[PDB]
Amino acid sequence: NGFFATMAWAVPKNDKNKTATNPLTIEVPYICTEGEDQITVWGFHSDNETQMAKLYGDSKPQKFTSSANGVTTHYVSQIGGFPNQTEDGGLPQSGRIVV
């Protein structure tokens, strides 16, 4: 078990304070040099209705926003059955990923 280098899959720790939150906001620092363009890769993950409540604290869909220098985008998750898996590594999973 691994993942994309490009991003980290934030699963909230263990039972604890695991629950649904209102949108959290995050700044993405510049990190590159000089006159370089910095391309940031990010996304999200959904699952079975029961798996969702197992993983995170929440059954309902979750919502996402990216803003970088004038360009705004908005996304909202799918809960129930997704498209048949494709171009993937080959193991069956109940969830999918948007990037």
Partner 1 sequence: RTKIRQLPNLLRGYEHIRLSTHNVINAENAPGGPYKIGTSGSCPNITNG
Partner 2 sequence: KNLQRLSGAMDELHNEILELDEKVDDLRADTISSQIELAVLLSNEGIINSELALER
Ligand X SMILES: *[C@@H]1O[C@H](CO)[C@@H](O[C@@H]2O[C@H](CO)[C@@H](O[C@@H]3O[C@H](CO)[C@@H](O)[C@H](O)[C@@H]3O)[C@H](O)[C@H]2NC(C)=O)[C@H](O)[C@H]1NC(C)=O
- Compare residues 72 and 84 and give the one whose CB is closer to ligand NAG: 84
Contacts of 67 (CB under 8 A, 6+ apart): 73
Q: Among candidates 47, 57, 40, 49, which has minimal Cα distance to 82?
A: 47
Residue 48 or 62 with smaller CB distance to ligand X: 48
Least distance from ligand X to the Cβ atom of residue 93, Å = 6
Where in 77-96 is the site for ligand X (CB under 6 A)? 94-95
As a whole number of angstroms, the longest Cα–Cα distance in the chain is: 47
Under the binding rule (CB under 8 A), the answer on residue 70 touching partner 2 is yes
